[PDB]
Amino acid sequence: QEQEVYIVGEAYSYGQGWVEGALTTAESTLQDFFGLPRPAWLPEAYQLLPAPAPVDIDNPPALACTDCKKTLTEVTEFAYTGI
Amino acid sequence: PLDVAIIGGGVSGTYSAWRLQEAQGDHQRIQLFEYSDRIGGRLFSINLPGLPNVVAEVGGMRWMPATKDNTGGHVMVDKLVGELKLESKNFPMGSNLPDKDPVGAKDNLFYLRGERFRLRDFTEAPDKIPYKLAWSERGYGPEDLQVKVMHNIYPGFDKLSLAEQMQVKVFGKEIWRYGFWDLLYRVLSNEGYQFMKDAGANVANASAVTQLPATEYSDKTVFLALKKGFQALPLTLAKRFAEVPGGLIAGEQRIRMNRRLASVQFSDDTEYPYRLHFQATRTVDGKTSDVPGAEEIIHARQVILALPRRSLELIQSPLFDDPWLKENIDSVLVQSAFKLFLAYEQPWWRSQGLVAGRSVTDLPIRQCYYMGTECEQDGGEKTLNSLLMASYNDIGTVPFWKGLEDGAPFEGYQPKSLQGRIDANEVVPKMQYQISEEMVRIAQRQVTSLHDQIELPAPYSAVYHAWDADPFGGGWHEWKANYRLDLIIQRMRHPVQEQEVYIVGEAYSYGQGWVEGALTTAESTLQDFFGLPRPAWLPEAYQLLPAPAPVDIDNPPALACTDCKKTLTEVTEFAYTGI
Amino acid sequence: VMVDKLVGELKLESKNFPMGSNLPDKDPVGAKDNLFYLRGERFRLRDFTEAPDKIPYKLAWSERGYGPEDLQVKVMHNIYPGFDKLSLAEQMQVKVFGKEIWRYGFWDLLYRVLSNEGYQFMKDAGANVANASAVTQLPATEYSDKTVFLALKKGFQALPLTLAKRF
Amino acid sequence: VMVDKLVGELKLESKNFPMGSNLPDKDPVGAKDNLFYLRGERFRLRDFTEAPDKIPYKLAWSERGYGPEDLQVKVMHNIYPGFDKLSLAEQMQVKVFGKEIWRYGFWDLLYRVLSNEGYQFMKDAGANVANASAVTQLPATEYSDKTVFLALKKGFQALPLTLAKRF
Ligand SMILES: Cc1cc2nc3c(=O)[nH]c(=O)nc-3n(C[C@H](O)[C@H](O)[C@H](O)COP(=O)(O)OP(=O)(O)OC[C@H]3O[C@@H](n4cnc5c(N)ncnc54)[C@H](O)[C@@H]3O)c2cc1C
């Protein structure tokens, strides 16, 4: 936090093994510690890096299932694919 | 000072009280006595922690809707449930997906003799079935095989009235004189019988007349359940019996829980000839024990014993010395039933292609039902918490599970959904039979084997119930061979002509194993010996109890075949189904 | 998205990166005829579903009839249904067999749910790393040769060169 | 010992109780040709070892090649080697899977060590009771049609009758 060295690239991205990983880390670091706006060509809808879980996830609050009917349907129909 | 004492807070008891109170309550003292602190008898519904909208039906769980013409299906249940404004839901026996051509039960599992196959393989891949069936028994599922067997014995047998079925002779003997297994031994290979038992419904020493009738299998067959659990039906009735306005006895005094009818004695009094001796009981954690002390004594004109066979046997009365009643109380077998529920945090089976209905195995667990996810229910919490039920009734498997009752209780674990809601030590409910850890480990291993998995998620909660001890003796009854069950059905409602004691309930009905049996016996007895009209909600088209055959059916007149062309066509086309 | 739009921005020409056949133009074979040679046996991709008896792995009865990718999808739904559709924050909180998923290595977690022959099959016919976090290896999608990929006509190195050139 | 010596004492005549054939007098067939008819299949006792492919139970690879009795011996040695040779007092102190053996029923203990098809095989081709104490059901001996049994020529009821007669 003290120093003004930044690390970008695929290595410590979410999109490892992709050029997308490298670009997303670079763009986020630029928007966050260099103050550059988001490019015109870059949509706002796109999340560059995944939001983290809380630092303390030991005994976390429950995950409320959003549209479980659709998830369970997808899962069962996938199973039917094999059968 | 009681005009009617009703013994038993099951569905037949509670229905009887409600009817009599709503009809004659203004001038008749009616009281309902129940052995335990719980109303419902063999209807018994619970919600496990984390599953507030997925009911675990430890007793009865579904009924067949009334037909359009109101002549078939469980008409009494369907219309009574309509009358009391209880909400019903579909009881699925398979998958609705894909919404275009629903798989139904076709993908549900079988694991028999070390082989795995799915239901669709009985017709699609009969080489997978590991039973050495006769050439003529291949290509049917177990149910369809039973239909074929029945048409072999007598074509269209299921479509005959009980009176005609009691006159049908096979291999020179009337069918009601055979036990199911003995009759099948004559027409079906040993491997066939083994196949029907294992992949299968039936009892081997029960009357062939009530076991043989079978229908063509169809996962499209519709069943209904109550959203609040089947126990809502008797509870509602009890609730509506103690809330009838008016009457000699005040609403809150009409139901007397925790009273075990110890005995019925005959008093010299002409007005109130029955002296009922009740023992007070207390119920702790679902277990009822006698409270030591005096017997409460009550006087009644009429008595309705809304009680199964074992319960009748535990009541002392000179009434039971009647030769007919002494002979015909033991005219029914009692089938023990056992249920195991396991609650999981996700429906691991949905990823295997399983949605509803049962998978079947020859492992001791026998059958597993997939019973529903909390989040997929109407107004259900946003939780993947799911319920699995296992059930067995077969005598041979019972000893296995019986040995696993001892040991440390299963404690479960507080699932994430319940964190900061329930206590960790309340995750596994306190029940009459407290599931042990060993039983849960072994059930989980057998469930894992059945689904062909290495390891499944562990259950966070469980419930075991046995319908075997007193007073129930078992889960349901079946007519024994060599008994004129058509005559016993009519007489047992009022067993001793002199006395004013009536017997109602599922035990000595035609519809044994169903709430419909209990309701039909109760309603007939009420219409016949209490004079109540038929309810408005109850159609006239529906026959409550089958008309009996003549007492002398030795050398009976011939049965004139009504539209034999249609029967023979049905029978032949059914045969084509297998071929 | 970043690559796609940045490539758009710098006016680099892209092309389809085919993963199979477009012929016959009516019903393209795709990757269905591409070869496998495993354990001395030859079969084609279509045989994972059309002819599963040709697959020379002694798979569990419940793991047959899937290609390697689809088998991984099935495994993931077995562990947690819809896991791939959760956010990273939710995936980091998912516990399996009493431990958070990000505390398992891929191979250790699979060992618990999939037969050894299953794992061997997914490795050989398969993407994955055995000691990598299960949270980033487990997410899988249904296989489809219709999945579209793009390449640069001048090669992917044209993207950094262009950038350097424009810097 | 008590029966044998008491029968000696009362001068009741005993005879061999054969469990198989004595012919041919050179190499007696014994029980090797006696029949089994299980699950629609026919085989003879000798086929448990001579032709195990004829046995129509899907036994584990490690349970094949034994007759039912020998399979029970194998199971018992798996649980505790030499268990049958221990005194009752020692057998009541033997713990398996963290519980004393006399706290298990036979079927529950076998469920842990033997496949379901194994149990089914031992019941069908087999002696045992499924809910009885494992301590008194588990002890088994190697099968041998050469095992000798005796009967009374006048029937076993001659023993109590004689006693009553001599009382
Ligand atoms: C496992 C299982 C599953 C079932 N599933 C279905 C199903 O899916 N569909 C269906 O339609 N039916 C089902 N049934 C059957 C249905 O539950 C019964 O047929 C019906 O509930 C019985 O009603 P009843 O009034 O005859 O008797 P019971 O329910 O037995 O009621 C008798 C009552 O009398 C009480 N009693 C006993 N002795 C005394 C005494 N001395 N004094 C006072 N009270 C006493 C008992 O405690 C009990 O409350 C099932 C049953 C079981 C066991």
Numbering used by the authors:
A (entry chain A): 512 to 594
B (entry chain A): 13 to 212, 216 to 594
C (entry chain A), D (entry chain A): 87 to 212, 216 to 256
Paper lines:
L-arginine oxidase (AROD, EC 1.4.3.25) is an oxidoreductase that catalyses the deamination of L-arginine, with flavin adenine dinucleotide (FAD) as a cofactor. Recently identified AROD from Pseudomonas sp. TPU 7192 (PT-AROD) demonstrates high selectivity for L-arginine.
Here, we report the structure of PT-AROD at a resolution of 2.3 Å by cryo-electron microscopy. PT-AROD adopts an octameric structure with D4 symmetry, which is consistent with its molecular weight in solution, estimated by mass photometry. Comparative analysis of this structure with that determined using X-ray crystallography reveals open and closed forms of the lid-like loop at the entrance to the substrate pocket.
